[PDB]
Enzyme design. Structure first.
Site, PDB file in Angstrom:
ATOM      1  N   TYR C 108       0.708  -1.136   0.101  1.00 35.68           N
ATOM      2  CA  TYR C 108       0.087   0.041   0.033  1.00 35.68           C
ATOM      3  C   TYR C 108       0.874   1.123  -0.066  1.00 35.68           C
ATOM      4  CZ  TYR C 108      -4.087  -2.880   1.125  1.00 35.68           C
ATOM      5  OH  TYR C 108      -5.239  -3.577   1.288  1.00 35.68           O
ATOM      6  N   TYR C 147      -0.824 -10.045   0.999  1.00 30.44           N
ATOM      7  CA  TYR C 147       0.315  -9.682   1.898  1.00 30.44           C
ATOM      8  C   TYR C 147       0.165 -10.104   3.268  1.00 30.44           C
ATOM      9  CZ  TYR C 147      -3.491  -6.105   3.221  1.00 30.44           C
ATOM     10  OH  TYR C 147      -4.659  -5.811   3.462  1.00 30.44           O
ATOM     11  N   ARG C 157      -3.200 -11.812   3.993  1.00 34.76           N
ATOM     12  CA  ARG C 157      -4.630 -11.676   3.312  1.00 34.76           C
ATOM     13  C   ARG C 157      -4.611 -12.281   1.997  1.00 34.76           C
ATOM     14  NH1 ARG C 157      -7.975  -8.029   4.338  1.00 34.76           N
ATOM     15  NH2 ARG C 157      -9.325  -9.775   4.077  1.00 34.76           N
ATOM     16  N   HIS C 160      -7.336  -8.601  -2.320  1.00 40.41           N
ATOM     17  CA  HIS C 160      -8.608  -7.833  -2.189  1.00 40.41           C
ATOM     18  C   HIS C 160      -8.398  -6.434  -2.495  1.00 40.41           C
ATOM     19  CE1 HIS C 160      -6.372  -7.069   1.481  1.00 40.41           C
ATOM     20  NE2 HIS C 160      -7.103  -5.966   1.667  1.00 40.41           N
ATOM     21  N   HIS C 162     -10.576  -2.993  -1.230  1.00 40.70           N
ATOM     22  CA  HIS C 162     -11.725  -2.515  -0.643  1.00 40.70           C
ATOM     23  C   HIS C 162     -12.591  -1.463  -1.112  1.00 40.70           C
ATOM     24  CE1 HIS C 162      -9.149  -3.269   3.272  1.00 40.70           C
ATOM     25  NE2 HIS C 162      -8.063  -3.354   2.457  1.00 40.70           N
TER      26      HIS C 162
HETATM   27 FE   LIG Z   1      -6.241  -4.328   2.645  1.00 38.84          FE
END
Ligand SMILES: [Fe+3]
Ligand SMILES: [Fe+3]
Ligand SMILES: [Fe+3]
Lengths: 236, 200, 237, 200, 237, 200, 200
Positions: C108, C147, C157, C160, C162
């Site tokens: 991110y 990640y 995770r 995905h 959001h």
């Molecule tokens: Fe996330």
């Protein structure tokens, strides 16, 4: 003034019949042995004719009256009707639907047909319709008979009506054949069986439609047609 | 994955396709309006041309029951979808091979250049769909012109054909028929000289 | 100004994840221990913002272009599209759909993310758009990577994206996560498993959508969203 | 019974919610127009106020990654739903707590009284939705004002909370920030002084 | 020099893909039309190179480091590991395993690849290693993306890594492709479907291997390889 | 019956096989040691020869992306399996055709005679494995030499090919390249002159 | 995914754990060699220390049937795995709380610094596993020292505890017992002051 503003879902050529289907003997020499070359959709492929202003005769959709030589044709009076939609379930309005078939005895009005079943002097076997604004079409005709053909030594076509549908572009244009619910010739026919997937064969069988019948007059069959899905271009 | 409604499957047009779609060629009476092989009236703009050809099977024998549909831009490179027998030009037509006339003919004008979806010009072409007994699903091809060599060499569709030799199968040969400009475009469905067929 | 003219179907809070889901460790201290207090719908709850007059940038929905520092992002080019409808099947037009995600490596573009997978200099990971008059939205992006995260000692995770969706009122507003068809990380994730009903989990998995793909260019995934059913008031007062 | 299509289930907004919904708060570059924490232009009607607060978990520790959405009537008791950065007043806004700024702030006006569905006046309030890492489905609450004691005592929503002591959790405390009228509304998610959360 | 001391189990050429698989269009003109001629195993077929004395570079098995131009590649960090055994279950030690792949976006570092997904300046896509004394190999890489190719009008390869394995003779040498657990592209691919038996397809799908993952670092996939069974000669001449 | 673990199934090497197995041929940088097309150091025993050839598909068109592995006895009829770039001779090598170099080459020595399992001498030969896009499982063949006619006529492997005319497909043609002894071995995958391919 | 054999599941040690693992503390006869609470003989290098503590449940009541296992580096920061009662130092020991003696004791030396797997020094620590009736799977913790404040502040394990306040639960308090250096390390299993427990 046709424009390129849409894309059509790619054909599944294992759902459609393959070119080479040897039990259908004429396909052996009339099937390409090289792979089809894939090309991107352009305005050449995503446009096609609209037939809204083709002038149809009054009886073009009514085979009981469009070869009138002094009486009605002999055979099972039927209405053949349905809806033309695309794969997204959108109706396909104002599209050209053409059909041809043999008479009640399996004889076509064509010089090359020498089957000994006689012609019917009040039957020609040819129709055409435009779908209405909600995608619906209807013809009135007689149920065609099966007929023998020089494939295997005892091969017979199921009763069938030939269909051509234009759709919105040359990419959607389709020729097919309609068969009739319950006919025991269907599973035996090497042309039907050019379609490998049995669920696809089922899509060509018209269903008896008592709801559409005219009591004391004619039965009815329902044959819905699905053409390739049409979407807007995006992110090109 | 997402699965849509499946498309109605194709079937062969069969030997009597002409009674439904080529009434004149079938020797049967025609209706008042038929869709046929004269795309251009004499007054239509552009270069007036005759197209003709024969269709061969894999044993090199003539296909005498072909049905062909064509779709082409007008001389100005625009597709005209509003089909009307009163039009000077229609982008769409039909022709056929029969037992009496093994060679199909079209009366049209040479199509103008049209761009692909990425904006690159395609060489002048006619889109062709071929139907017949023995053909379970119709075959798509293109007819290009042997007097457009420079444009043909740069066509992004032609250039998707991996072998130069196969590209030559889509190039129609200029000649003269009764003093008029014509092009011959033979189609070989199978075997030596097999015509390029497309999927799209 | 807004009016109270509609009622929204009550939420099934056993279909949604419950607040306390201890395998998702941060929920243990961020979950209320008292019961929620139920209140009747009034104008305060049955109205909410409409974003028709918010000014969107040209590329706000296109993550391949909206963080352009001299090139394309690295990764699997995908369209993510779908329809927003309510529980009665009615489309929800002109509604705000916002999305954010990691890059192709699971990183991110946020200061707090120290994962050692590199940032992509041409990827920001943020999109928005308004649904069209028929409820449809679409974004173009790259497929995010899984990640690792500090929950259990080896928790990852699934890939995905959001999502946040406004809908017609504050009663309909929803934040969720989209996952991708067939990802073997989905059954193992404690955040996915905060949803107790496996059928509800399935509703968060986007399906591969070959029909919407651009050949020689990008694949496509389809993610349809269902917001609370909206009805007219009847027999009140 | 009649079962409708199920609602898409909620999931936590997670720790990086700001990159999608609070770009300035995330220290990332902003787009031309962002939905943020200034509901009122300086000439909007009504009493201009600052709201601020901190968010605590069940251990009494600050939640430094929360994201909040608010919805309130304007000073004349009207909900302004046509969101627009050019409006004198927007009824909707967003704010956040972050590692740098653990205290959220909102610049607005004191809301006017609106009636519930039975026509009973509600005390002035701000509807709040709270999202964060660890919060699987967002928490609804209301901020009421300590200088509206007469109205609060009669509010039909506050009176649905069975215990007076829990009603006190929804009353923001009047204070001054930089000499300006402000109200502080701390949220305790869990444990002692737990804030009342609503379902509707 | 090499000796003829072993025999290899005959290949099942209905388990392997057949030569002519027309949906995979390039196979139509690159498939023999005459039958293969069967010949008995001799020293020419039952021997082959051993690569124990080939000099491998430090990073030959590590694609995160072996194309290092100032940083890490972008994409999903994974270990790909497994064991090479023969059909009798015997490990195949000290054997050469080579692999190549596209980057995270489905782009190969080859001049002929013009896909519009960008090259990654820190990714080359090539690895090799020798199996250890117990048959085990391992590589570290990024997960490759799917990519479009000119077969049908909208055909996409599933994510895959190409493998080549030498084994004990030229009779055992194999080239194949590894695919990834749950990828919805696998059932749609005409190259995968060149294999007629669905059980054989399953043998090419690598499984997610959380046990071999490095927490906070990289995931892992397991791909075991079975080469032709080797036996001693018996009762010959 | 007894069923063993199934073998991992083959898949095509595909169009980018060179990036993994022919790095120099791919125009990518090489590693310190690569397995390539020079089997013999200049002082290796035996008659030093160049092998070369082109690969054709079923349409007679060049295969410009093939990858080949070879395995041959040394000049004394010994298979040298301990692969090493320092060896005077390696029995194994690799070569390729590419867009730039459509003709593969191999620098080696003429192999010596080896016996089959029954102790019958085989004619001098090179074992070849062919990989490419479109080839789902690699094709095995053998290259024999046209100046070994006496030995070839007696080879127990060549004699397993039922037709003499097909035996001719495996015989490489002696020629000269840059004045040096060479043998040309073209492979036709399909159709006229189709090269014999083996299963073992 | 790959699934290995599942691990045998844990069960509580139960109330009589001492008869099997703390024979002396159980008031039962010991065997010739027991593993107990004296890690260091008097001659062992390093700073000799007494460790002691009490164990509390969630109601603040003493746990009088605890069993504890400890694992620590020697004064030089090396783990000694070769357990032998003749050693001057063993890295491993056991202790217990009982009804007679609610406070466990250990006799050891202060452990030296050891690096984590990334090479970053950890502050001096003792690894502790806690077993008892009511504990279904043992609890792992670490004991650090209040006179290593600088090292503690930089420990990469301590720094994985998100809240500073919780870090304080792992810091043992220096004192003197009978003129000797001691540290007290109380463990609170649940509630106010709950000791940090680890998973690894
Ligand atoms: Fe996330
Ligand atoms: Fe017929
Ligand atoms: Fe590949």
């Amino acid at each position: 003034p046709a424009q390129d503003n849409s894309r059509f879902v790619i054909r599944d050529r294992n759902w459609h019949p393959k070119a080479l289907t040897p039990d259908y003997k004429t396909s052996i020499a009339r099937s390409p042995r090289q792979a089809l070359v894939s090309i991107p959709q352009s305005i050449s492929e995503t446009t096609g004719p609209n037939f809204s202003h083709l002038g149809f005769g009054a009886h073009d959709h009514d085979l009981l009256l469009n070869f009138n030589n002094g009486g009605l044709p002999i055979g099972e009076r039927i209405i053949v009707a349905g809806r033309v939609v695309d794969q997204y379930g959108k109706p396909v309005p104002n599209t050209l639907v053409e059909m041809w078939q043999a008479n009640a005895g399996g004889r076509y009005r064509h010089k090359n047909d020498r089957y000994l079943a006689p012609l019917d002097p009040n039957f020609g076997g040819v129709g055409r319709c435009l779908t209405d604004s909600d995608g619906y079409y209807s013809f009135r005709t007689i149920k065609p008979g099966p007929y023998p053909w020089r494939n295997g030594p005892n091969d017979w076509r199921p009763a069938h009506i030939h269909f051509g549908i234009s759709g919105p572009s040359i990419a959607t244009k389709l020729i097919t054949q309609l068969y009739f619910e319950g006919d025991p010739l269907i599973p035996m026919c090497p042309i039907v069986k050019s379609i490998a997937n049995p669920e696809a064969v089922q899509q060509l069988i018209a269903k008896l439609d008592m709801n559409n019948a005219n009591p004391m007059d004619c039965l009815a069959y329902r044959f819905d047609i699905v053409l390739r899905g049409q979407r807007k271009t995006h992110f090109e | 994955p997402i699965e849509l409604l499946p498309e109605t499957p194709s079937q062969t047009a069969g030997p009597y396709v002409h009674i439904g779609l080529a009434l004149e060629a079938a020797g049967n009476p025609t209706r008042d309006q038929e869709i046929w092989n004269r795309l251009a009236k004499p007054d239509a703009p552009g270069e007036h041309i005759l197209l003709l050809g024969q269709v061969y099977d894999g044993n090199g024998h003539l296909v005498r029951d072909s049905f062909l549909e064509v779709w082409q831009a007008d001389a100005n490179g625009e597709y005209q979808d509003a089909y009307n027998l009163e039009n000077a030009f229609n982008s769409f037509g039909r022709t056929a091979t029969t037992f009496d006339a093994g060679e199909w003919t079209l009366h049209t004008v040479k199509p103008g250049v049209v761009n692909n979806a990425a904006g690159v010009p395609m060489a002048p072409h006619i889109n062709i769909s071929l139907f017949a007994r023995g053909i379970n699903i119709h075959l798509h091809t293109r007819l290009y012109f042997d007097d457009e060599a420079q444009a043909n060499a740069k066509c992004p569709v032609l250039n998707l054909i991996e072998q130069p030799q196969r590209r030559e199968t889509l190039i129609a040969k200029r000649c003269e028929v009764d003093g008029k400009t014509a092009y011959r475009f033979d189609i070989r469905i199978q075997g030596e000289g097999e015509t390029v067929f497309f999927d799209f």
